[PDB]
Assembly symmetry: C6
Homo-oligomer: 222 residues x 6
Amino acid sequence: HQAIAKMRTMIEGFDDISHGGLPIGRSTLVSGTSGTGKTLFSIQFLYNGIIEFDEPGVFVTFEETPQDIIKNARSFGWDLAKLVDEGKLFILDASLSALIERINYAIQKYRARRVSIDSVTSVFQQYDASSVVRRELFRLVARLKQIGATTVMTTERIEEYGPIARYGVEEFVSDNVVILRNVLEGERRRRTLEILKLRGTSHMKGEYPFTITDHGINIFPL
Amino acid sequence: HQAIAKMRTMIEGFDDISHGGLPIGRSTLVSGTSGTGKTLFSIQFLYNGIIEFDEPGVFVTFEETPQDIIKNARSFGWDLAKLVDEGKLFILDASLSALIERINYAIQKYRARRVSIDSVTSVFQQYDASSVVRRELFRLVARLKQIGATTVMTTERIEEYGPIARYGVEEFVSDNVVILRNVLEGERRRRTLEILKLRGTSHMKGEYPFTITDHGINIFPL
Amino acid sequence: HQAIAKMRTMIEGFDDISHGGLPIGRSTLVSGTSGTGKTLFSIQFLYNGIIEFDEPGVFVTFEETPQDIIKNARSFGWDLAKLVDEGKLFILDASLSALIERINYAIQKYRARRVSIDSVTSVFQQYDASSVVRRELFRLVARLKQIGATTVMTTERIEEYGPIARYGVEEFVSDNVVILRNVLEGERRRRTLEILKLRGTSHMKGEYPFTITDHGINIFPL
Amino acid sequence: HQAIAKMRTMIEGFDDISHGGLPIGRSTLVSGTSGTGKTLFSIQFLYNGIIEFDEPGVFVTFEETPQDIIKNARSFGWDLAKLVDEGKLFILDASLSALIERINYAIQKYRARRVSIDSVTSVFQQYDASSVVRRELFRLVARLKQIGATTVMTTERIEEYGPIARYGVEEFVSDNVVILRNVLEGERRRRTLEILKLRGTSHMKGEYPFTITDHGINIFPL
Amino acid sequence: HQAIAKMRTMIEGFDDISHGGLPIGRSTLVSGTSGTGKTLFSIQFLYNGIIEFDEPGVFVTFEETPQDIIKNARSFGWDLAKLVDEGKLFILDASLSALIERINYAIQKYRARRVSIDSVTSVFQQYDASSVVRRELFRLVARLKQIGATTVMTTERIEEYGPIARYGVEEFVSDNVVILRNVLEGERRRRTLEILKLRGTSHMKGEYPFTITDHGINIFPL
Amino acid sequence: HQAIAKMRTMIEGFDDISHGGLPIGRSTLVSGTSGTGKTLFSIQFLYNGIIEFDEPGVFVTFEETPQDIIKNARSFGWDLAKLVDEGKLFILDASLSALIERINYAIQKYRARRVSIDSVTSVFQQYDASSVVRRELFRLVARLKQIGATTVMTTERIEEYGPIARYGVEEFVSDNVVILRNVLEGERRRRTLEILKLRGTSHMKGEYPFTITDHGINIFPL
Ligand SMILES: Nc1ncnc2c1ncn2[C@@H]1O[C@H](COP(=O)(O)OP(=O)(O)OP(=O)(O)O)[C@@H](O)[C@H]1O
Ligand SMILES: Nc1ncnc2c1ncn2[C@@H]1O[C@H](COP(=O)(O)OP(=O)(O)OP(=O)(O)O)[C@@H](O)[C@H]1O
Ligand SMILES: Nc1ncnc2c1ncn2[C@@H]1O[C@H](COP(=O)(O)OP(=O)(O)OP(=O)(O)O)[C@@H](O)[C@H]1O
Ligand SMILES: Nc1ncnc2c1ncn2[C@@H]1O[C@H](COP(=O)(O)OP(=O)(O)OP(=O)(O)O)[C@@H](O)[C@H]1O
Ligand SMILES: Nc1ncnc2c1ncn2[C@@H]1O[C@H](COP(=O)(O)OP(=O)(O)OP(=O)(O)O)[C@@H](O)[C@H]1O
Ligand SMILES: Nc1ncnc2c1ncn2[C@@H]1O[C@H](COP(=O)(O)OP(=O)(O)OP(=O)(O)O)[C@@H](O)[C@H]1O
Ligand SMILES: [Mg+2]
Ligand SMILES: [Mg+2]
Ligand SMILES: [Mg+2]
Ligand SMILES: [Mg+2]
Ligand SMILES: [Mg+2]
Ligand SMILES: [Mg+2]
């Protein structure tokens, strides 16, 4: 009566609203506007995995250099430089088949099953039509599932209440969709987290407030 | 005073609001946003048919592999692998004339009159103009009606309250239209099912709540 | 002080709100979203004419086969097969000059003055620009007026409260415009009928509810 | 302190809200959706002029034949056929320089200073860019002013509360702009008339109700 | 603590809300929909300057002939023909480098430092991209500032509450922006004047009502 | 637990809501509509730096000449001419690699670590696609970070509540985003300042009123 296994992301409150955490072997799409916490979410997923379960991670980035990410993480107190030196964490700088080959090579070398992709929207900006975007996204998700590494891919969206992704096709390809919203009402911004869908497993429905503190993302499972 | 015959879908509450179930020999278009339950609807239609009436089914999929669908079904407790091995269910992996020929060949081989199409939107993404989309959709619906197999085709739409399909032409070709809506109000999502039209037979008018539980879709015929 | 003659459509309540029925020799444009009753309106116009005034009719269809229309009509109790066999009704299957020639040939052969066109939108989908759409629509309307047969042409529109037709030019060519709206409010759908204009004769202003029952369209002239 | 002369249109109530009627020698743009009364306005202007001041008129039409206009006018009791036979009224059927030459020739032949243009939007549909539309409209208005005949040109607009014309450039070329609106509120339509501007003379500001009765347009100058 | 000099426009109430009038040597962009008073504003600026300070002016027009402008001005009681004959006012008929050369030649010949441009939108209609529009507008503004003549350039906008100009780039090039709005509420139109910005000097913030009377524009500095 | 250093902008109240001021070595994007205070913000940043910390600055401008900026600054009482003569301030007139080379040359020559860019939107207007805009913006930001000079780049946006930049990609490239809004409500304009994000450091959330007085921008840290 159950055939889905989940690995805990160890993010405070996210496992409660995801009913066990992120499913193992499936690629999640985390979408939100600028300043919501996509990069922080993808960094904290890998960092918590490495700290708790001793499971290494690979963080592929396109819009940032590794040093900037390390400084932003040390802002929270996470010494990612020590993890990179010890080999428990890998950071890949690519700034599509070659990217998948490099990710697979890193996964095999570091014996890591956890992947975070900071910006696939920047990669898809090169392509023109949304059909090609869907094809490339499906190819990447299929390769990630074949490898067997749980992946958190973050994409950018324009409007707080509108299409889940700018192209509008990301929501219909990824197995799991998580949405971060920075809603501006009454001249004040509020952060909300929503689990749009989880193919093959139950999850909470609605939006729940969360705060980006000095220790990382903290979701309130009200 | 009546010349329309209907086969029960055995979905809890859907037959009550459809006034006898899905008409026999006509192709339905089930449209909704991501995470509403189109794939689950198409899977449950075939599974309930096979279990109750011993009527085999063919499930043609484009955006997923058969193994993923089997795992997602086993999440509900449906052992689709046993049905596939016994021959009471067929799953087709195509990832347009060749597709119709393959569907007809499967129908003839398995002596099955029930077809589910998980994503024709992905197929239509290749075409550019909406006129070509209408032509291909009409060709597929005509072939399905000529074969005589009741079909449930699922398409993707962007906005909860907007065009029935992304191209806007699907609603005017399919004989029957069913709409699943995932409405986000008050930072909470609500699932609703609507029967937009049934060419040649009566149906309930409006939208009715439904829930995706661990046993499948359950519609409340209030 | 009057130079306009009208033939009664015999639709329950439509003659009351049209102040005498559809004008003779002019082509009406019946526009509405999917599931509103355009095809049923065009079928009932011809059927009521044949039954009451013994005036034969021609029903030209593009998106459907004659057999499907006959079955949908028999759902209401209308034995259109008997009328077709007796010659009192003709059904034309075209699935633009050749179409007009065929319609004129059918009109001359069957001595019928009543024409219904189920989908000119599908024909206009081939053309690209709205100017060509306007030119073709004007040509068809002029030919219909020259023939002298009262015509009911049905077109498709996307939004309940928006452009009268998808191209936006149909309203400015046809002499008479009738609008069927399927308004979704409070998670319930309501059917309304409106007479946008009647060139050269008075009509009621506003929208009136109507219901599609088992006997056909029934408008309430409140 | 005044250098503008006005000719009364004799339309009931329009002269009161226009403060003396339509200015002499300037071309008006009457814009409204379908079924508002543009064609009736242009016909009644010429008919009232001919009846009262014995000043002949020229009515150039593109979307209709003269016979249809004559029948629609006789619906109100206006025997335009007698006026055409007597030479007090001319009707031109053109279905851009040649059009202006023909209008000037008719004006010279019939010694008439009053012109109505039923559809310049249909003519402008041939052109692609709005700059060409503006150029052609300015050329026509300049030619009409050089001839010295008061002109009422009617154009089509899509939305009740939106751009004054479909192209959006008509309002900035014509000296005078009149807007007819058919507002649908509470499932009921209401007719309103507005004078957007009169270059060089004062006018009432706002919108006033008007009714199309069996005698013609009747505006209430509240 | 101050390095900006202003010349009074002598328009009733505009100097109060502009805190000293239009800055000397800078080009203003006056934007509004049709019928708001852009042409009247540009005419009254020059006329008041000539009458009060004996400072001649140049009025360059594109959408109108000089005679029409003279008649519209005489509607208010302004005998612009006498001023043109005396040489205290020049009217230029151009219906982009040649235009600037002609304006400079007129400025040098008539020893005038005041320029009004009635329609640069019509000139920019020839260009396709908004980048070229920005380049040409910047070139014209730079030439006007180099000449040293205070200029009032009027542009056309479509929506009452939307982009300041149709192209959306005029607001970011001109040093000073004034907006005239004709707001339609409650079936009544209200005229409002706003000073969007004044580069290098203070101004009132908000919108103030104004009326176009028989003596010209009159702003209420509430 | 902290690896981010900040240099105070000395703007009244901005350091309080930014929690220490602008981060050192990162490029900020200040976005707002016309008349909000982007140019004044970029000028005041450099001027306050030079006055307080004796840290020279470079102001690169595209839409204005240096003399106009000097006059607008002297409107506030800032004698930028004296600073330019003394060498404590440099103003660059460029009216993309050559621009970066010139900025680096100025930085090296004047031993200044502070840069303000008045209009990169005008530069990006030359490019067509938003992908090229993103690439050029990322290149410029990377070069600025490599140089090590704190930069304030100002971009233009159309709608008060809409995309952060006109292209919609600026918000996802710059490390820090500040938004100035000129909200028109009740026929009155209100100025608000918001810090959308600060990569790697905390900041206040919401919008706070600010006023452009005769001494410069003054933000109220309520
Ligand atoms: N130490 C911290 N304390 C609090 N908030 C922090 C801290 N460090 C970073 N942030 C938050 O990080 C946010 C922006 O950084 P983040 O990495 O989340 O960006 P993002 O949403 O992924 O951006 P993008 O869309 O450009 O990829 C800011 O809103 C800020 O509040
Ligand atoms: N065992 C389960 N219990 C409850 N809900 C489940 C279960 N398995 C799946 N779901 C539901 O399935 C939904 C998504 O899966 P589903 O197959 O319905 O997608 P879909 O709407 O067809 O997607 P797409 O638009 O990508 O084709 C989630 O919202 C989740 O709630
Ligand atoms: N026997 C019946 N009793 C009640 N309603 C019926 C019956 N037969 C058909 N209908 C109605 O017919 C509607 C759809 O069929 P119809 O022929 O009116 O479509 P349509 O609006 O012309 O479609 P399209 O836009 O695709 O041309 C349904 O909403 C259904 O309620
Ligand atoms: N005798 C009449 N009594 C009342 N109303 C009439 C009469 N004759 C015509 N009408 C009115 O004429 C209107 C449509 O005809 P009209 O000539 O005004 O069209 P229009 O607005 O110019 O159309 P288009 O946009 O297609 O050019 C209808 O709304 C109808 O009410
Ligand atoms: N003597 C007058 N008394 C009152 N109002 C007048 C008078 N003369 C002209 N007007 C006003 O002039 C307005 C239109 O003329 P105006 O020159 O202001 O047009 P505009 O806004 O510049 O037009 P466009 O956008 O076509 O350039 C009308 O709304 C009218 O009220
Ligand atoms: N001395 C001053 N006192 C008050 N406000 C001033 C003063 N000088 C300039 N301003 C303000 O400057 C604003 C416009 O100048 P500013 O340099 O801020 O433009 P901006 O927003 O950068 O423009 P753009 O979008 O064209 O680049 C006006 O709204 C005005 O109120
Ligand atoms: Mg980020
Ligand atoms: Mg699915
Ligand atoms: Mg139909
Ligand atoms: Mg008309
Ligand atoms: Mg004007
Ligand atoms: Mg500025």
